[model samples]
Target: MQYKLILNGKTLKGETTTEAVDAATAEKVFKQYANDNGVDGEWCYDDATKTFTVTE
Candidate 1:
């Protein structure tokens, strides 16, 4: 699955599969993005679906 994160009006994208696995992996993948781009915002995760909602 792919996730998109909007930060400061910009949209960033992430992808992962399998509940926490995906969410955690995506976070790691977007680490550079989060740090460099200041991805400080809101995010939601569904353990049942292993999905994420990240917004700036």
Candidate 2:
């Protein structure tokens, strides 16, 4: 399995970042980013076909 955090940035160019971590460490980055910037998001390592989606 793998883990990552959706990038929280301001470059206005791309829309992703890079890092490898365990769940706890990744959660840190996730909450850290979601807190610093207001967003509806989650972090995980789920193996599925998906995208940055919103239809719920």
Candidate 3:
């Protein structure tokens, strides 16, 4: 499945950048992003669209 790793414009310099990754990478990146950002935001996964989005 495909996923998207997005660092929302909450504390990420106001830029909503996106990346395409696999499920494993998506999970890894989510944890890494939260750890680095210290916000532990939120995420949503859409099976139909095969997309993952993380927001801050």
- The alpha-carbon deviation from the true structure for residue 6 of candidate 1, after best TM-score superposition, in angstroms, is 9.0
lDDT of each: 0.55, 0.41, 0.59
Candidate 1: deviation at residue 50, Å?
Answer: 0.7
Error of 2 at 18 (Å): 3.6
Model 3: residue 32 alpha-carbon error in angstroms: 1.2
Clashing pairs in 3: none
Tell me the TM-score of model 1: 0.40
TM-score of 3: 0.48
Q: Candidate 1, after superposition: displacement of residue 40 in Å?
A: 1.2
Model 1 clash tally, residue pairs? 2
Error of 2 at 15 (Å): 4.7
Each candidate: RMSD: 4.9, 5.9, 3.8
Candidate 2 residue-wise lDDT, 1-56, digit = tens: 24434443343112333353554565555556555654544333433522121110
Better of 2 and 3 by lDDT: 3
TM-scores, one per candidate? 0.40, 0.39, 0.48
Higher-lDDT candidate of 1 and 2: 1
Span of 10 residues, lowest total lDDT, candidate 1: 12-21
